[PDB]
Amino acid sequence: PTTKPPTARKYIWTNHKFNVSGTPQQYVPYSTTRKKIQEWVPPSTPYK
């Protein structure tokens, strides 16, 4: 990469990170989609 430097992009990490498994920086999976079914909200006032 000294004679043939990589192409620059603004989204490329400027700081390389190593394998962070076993550390508080480790990756934790989670669902990335929104809630599908919306529940009815009962009225907040007494009905009688």
- Pick between residue 18 and residue 30 the one whose CB is nearest to another protein: 30
* Subset of residues 1 to 48 that bind another protein, contact rule: CB under 8 A: 10-11, 24-34, 36-44, 46-48
Using the CB atoms, write b or e for 9-38: b if 16+ within 10 Å: eeeeeeeeeeeeeeeeeeeeeeeeeeeeee
Q: What is the nearest approach in angstroms of another protein to the Cβ of residue 1?
A: 21
Q: Interface with another protein by CB under 8 A: which residues?
A: 10-11, 24-34, 36-44, 46-48
